């Protein structure tokens, strides 16, 4: 994939957005912006130019599933890759997210190696 792919990192904790941003930088992905819930995320995505979304499952106002559905239902942004982050895996959440169009999920806390594997799995699936 393009190392200048523009990432949107979405979570309601600044510490976790910084973790994800720094892990991305470790992998060579430095073009990173942040949002604090799904509504803020959509406000940013409407500006255009994004190439990948990493979003937490659990956020106020608009959660990860709702963000994902809104992206997918739209548009120019509708095929954007979306990696869902969650504090605890659950069968029903995984299926709901996948059926709604998630590109992958990952349980936090995670390492750079785990994130790299996840991104590479998604890029391979999507032909990127």
Curated annotation (Swiss-Prot):
Its cofactor is Mg(2+). GO terms for molecular function: acetyltransferase activity; magnesium ion binding; phosphorelay response regulator activity. It is found in: Cytoplasm. Mg(2+) binds at residues 11-12, 56, 58. The modification N6-acetyllysine is found at residues 91, 108. Residues 6-123 form the Response regulatory domain. Coiled coil: none annotated. Keywords: Acetylation, Chemotaxis, Cytoplasm, Flagellar rotation, Magnesium, Metal-binding, Phosphoprotein, Two-component regulatory system. GO terms for biological process: aerotaxis; bacterial-type flagellum-dependent swimming motility; chemotaxis; internal peptidyl-lysine acetylation; phosphorelay signal transduction system; regulation of bacterial-type flagellum-dependent cell motility; regulation of chemotaxis; signal transduction. Binds 1 Mg(2+) ion per subunit. GO terms for cellular component: bacterial-type flagellum; bacterial-type flagellum basal body, C ring; bacterial-type flagellum rotor complex; cytoplasm; cytosol. Phosphorylated by CheA or acetylated by acetyl-CoA synthetase, depending on which acetate metabolism pathway is available. The major acetylation site seems to be Lys-91. Dephosphorylated (inactivated) by CheZ. Changing residue 11 to A: Abolishes magnesium binding. SMART domains: REC. Involved in the transmission of sensory signals from the chemoreceptors to the flagellar motors. In its active (phosphorylated or acetylated) form, CheY exhibits enhanced binding to a switch component, FliM, at the flagellar motor which induces a change from counterclockwise to clockwise flagellar rotation. Overexpression of CheY in association with MotA and MotB improves motility of a ycgR disruption, suggesting there is an interaction (direct or indirect) between the c-di-GMP-binding flagellar brake protein and the flagellar stator. This is Chemotaxis protein CheY. It comes from Escherichia coli (strain K12).
